[PDB]
Design an enzyme around this catalytic site. Structure first.
Site, PDB file in Angstrom:
ATOM      1  CG  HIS A   1      -1.561   1.269   1.579  1.00 27.68           C
ATOM      2  ND1 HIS A   1      -2.659   1.742   0.966  1.00 27.68           N
ATOM      3  CD2 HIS A   1      -1.243   2.184   2.569  1.00 27.68           C
ATOM      4  CE1 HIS A   1      -2.991   2.922   1.505  1.00 27.68           C
ATOM      5  NE2 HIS A   1      -2.135   3.184   2.488  1.00 27.68           N
TER       6      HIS A   1
ATOM      7  CG  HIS B   1       0.587   6.571   0.693  1.00 25.83           C
ATOM      8  ND1 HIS B   1      -0.234   7.632   0.911  1.00 25.83           N
ATOM      9  CD2 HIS B   1       0.110   5.527   1.478  1.00 25.83           C
ATOM     10  CE1 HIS B   1      -1.175   7.279   1.794  1.00 25.83           C
ATOM     11  NE2 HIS B   1      -0.952   5.981   2.147  1.00 25.83           N
TER      12      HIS B   1
ATOM     13  CD  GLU C   1      -4.675   6.307   2.831  1.00 21.67           C
ATOM     14  OE1 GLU C   1      -5.004   5.203   2.343  1.00 21.67           O
ATOM     15  OE2 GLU C   1      -3.502   6.569   3.174  1.00 21.67           O
TER      16      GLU C   1
ATOM     17  CB  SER D   1      -2.823  -0.083  -2.424  1.00 21.21           C
ATOM     18  OG  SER D   1      -3.661   0.436  -1.393  1.00 21.21           O
TER      19      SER D   1
HETATM   20  C1  LIG Z   1      -4.235   9.534   9.645  1.00 23.79           C
HETATM   21  C2  LIG Z   1      -3.391   8.251   9.623  1.00 23.79           C
HETATM   22  C3  LIG Z   1      -2.387   8.017  10.569  1.00 23.79           C
HETATM   23  C4  LIG Z   1      -1.625   6.838  10.517  1.00 23.79           C
HETATM   24  N1  LIG Z   1      -1.861   5.934   9.561  1.00 23.79           N
HETATM   25  C5  LIG Z   1      -2.816   6.141   8.624  1.00 23.79           C
HETATM   26  N2  LIG Z   1      -3.118   5.213   7.628  1.00 23.79           N
HETATM   27  C6  LIG Z   1      -2.569   5.316   6.347  1.00 23.79           C
HETATM   28  S1  LIG Z   1      -1.425   6.512   5.971  1.00 23.79           S
HETATM   29  N3  LIG Z   1      -2.932   4.385   5.358  1.00 23.79           N
HETATM   30  C7  LIG Z   1      -3.861   3.373   5.655  1.00 23.79           C
HETATM   31  S2  LIG Z   1      -4.456   2.119   4.631  1.00 23.79           S
HETATM   32  C8  LIG Z   1      -5.496   1.416   5.820  1.00 23.79           C
HETATM   33  C9  LIG Z   1      -6.403   0.180   5.583  1.00 23.79           C
HETATM   34  C10 LIG Z   1      -5.367   2.145   7.021  1.00 23.79           C
HETATM   35  C11 LIG Z   1      -6.174   1.756   8.289  1.00 23.79           C
HETATM   36  C12 LIG Z   1      -4.451   3.242   6.954  1.00 23.79           C
HETATM   37  C13 LIG Z   1      -4.072   4.188   7.939  1.00 23.79           C
HETATM   38  O1  LIG Z   1      -4.552   4.160   9.089  1.00 23.79           O
HETATM   39  C14 LIG Z   1      -3.612   7.299   8.634  1.00 23.79           C
HETATM   40 FE   LIG Z   2      -2.239   5.080   3.484  1.00 26.61          FE
END
Ligand SMILES: Cc1ccnc(-n2c(S)nc3sc(C)c(C)c3c2=O)c1
Ligand SMILES: [Fe+3]
Length: 309
Positions: free
Chosen positions: A169, A174, A214, A233
């Site tokens: 992912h 990203h 996202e 992703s």
């Molecule tokens: C705001 C914040 C803080 C830390 N991590 C995140 N973060 C990010 S960057 N990508 C993903 S993909 C997915 C299935 C989840 C749950 C998730 C996620 O939680 C978001």
């Molecule tokens: Fe993410």
């Protein structure tokens, strides 16, 4: 009493380890729950993040054949969609990531190589992260153009499913957008907005993040394309997001900020951005509504946040 935030880039060391210590992979639910080798591997990646300090090279890891296979499956499946579904910025950078970074079915890229590549593109850098950081901490990193990034891979039994961020992912979702200057400035704007903001606004910013970084769609001439990491992703959702099923609305921050969402099914609704410059301007206007007794800007020469009045 205003919430603390880092004022130098080295100060991201401070709360970087303040993760949820009891993570998703501990739940009985997790694809890897019964797998003790997987459990230990996960803790191994976590210890790498734990010991990382800003400025160091990111430690390289020899991935197992099983892990490379999982990556392979995610890579090949998703690759088949990008030309038709992903935004120009994505498709523009992908071949460079293949040439210089080892983005290939048989090879899981190393974070250090990817971080160097990004630094060259936009000054974005990676920092390995153990697990889930608060939105406050995660979004603050973006202000310095630092993306907290996982290093571990989803369990091999379910290659099309992850409830969590994993390496697939981060790199396929990203990294390609963080290579674009306009996207990079947008994402940083969200970070700047978060600095010293009240809890209520951290949550509004996290929601904006979710509907952009996202799960965002963007106009591309007469067409619409995916740019959100969660879409890029997800094989299933990438195709669904641009079919007639979901509802689409223009990105509009006073509505986007309060909109509810779930993580477990496809989004019933997406917000469409005009461009990343326009989303940035909108975030900049929204940040001005946040009660903060100061103003912030990042000085990239010294890697410090300047705080006025
Ligand atoms: C705001 C914040 C803080 C830390 N991590 C995140 N973060 C990010 S960057 N990508 C993903 S993909 C997915 C299935 C989840 C749950 C998730 C996620 O939680 C978001
Ligand atoms: Fe993410």
């Amino acid at each position: 009493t205003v919430p603390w935030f880092p004022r130098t880039i080295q100060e991201l060391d401070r709360f970087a380890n303040q993760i949820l210590s009891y993570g998703a992979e501990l739940d009985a639910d997790h694809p890897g729950f019964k797998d003790p080798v997987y459990r230990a591997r996960r803790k191994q990646f976590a210890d790498i993040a734990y010991n990382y300090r800003h400025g160091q090279p990111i430690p390289r890891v020899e991935y197992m054949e099983e892990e490379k296979k999982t990556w392979g499956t995610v890579f090949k499946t998703l690759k088949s969609l990008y030309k038709t579904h992903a935004c120009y910025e994505y498709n523009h950078i992908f071949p460079l990531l293949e040439k210089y970074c080892g983005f290939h079915e048989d090879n899981i890229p190393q974070l250090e190589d990817v971080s160097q590549f990004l630094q060259t593109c936009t000054g974005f850098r990676l920092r390995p992260v153990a697990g889930l950081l608060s939105s406050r901490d995660f979004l603050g990193g973006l202000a310095f153009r630092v993306f907290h990034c996982t290093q571990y891979i989803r369990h091999g039994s379910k290659p099309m499913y992850t409830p969590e961020p994993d390496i697939c992912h981060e790199l396929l979702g990203h990294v390609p957008l963080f290579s674009d200057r306009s996207f990079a400035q947008f994402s940083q704007e969200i970070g700047l907005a978060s600095l010293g903001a009240p809890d209520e606004y951290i949550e509004k910013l996290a929601t904006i993040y979710w509907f952009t970084v996202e799960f965002g769609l963007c106009k591309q001439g007469d067409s619409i394309k995916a740019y959100g990491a969660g879409l890029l992703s997800s094989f299933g959702e990438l195709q669904y997001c641009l079919s007639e099923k979901p509802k689409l609305l223009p990105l509009e921050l006073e509505k986007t900020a309060i909109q509810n969402y779930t993580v477990t099914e496809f989004q019933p609704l997406y917000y469409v951005a005009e461009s990343f410059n326009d989303a940035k301007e909108k975030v900049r206007n929204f940040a001005a509504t946040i009660p903060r007794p100061f103003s912030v800007r990042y000085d990239p020469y010294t890697q410090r946040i300047e705080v006025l009045d």
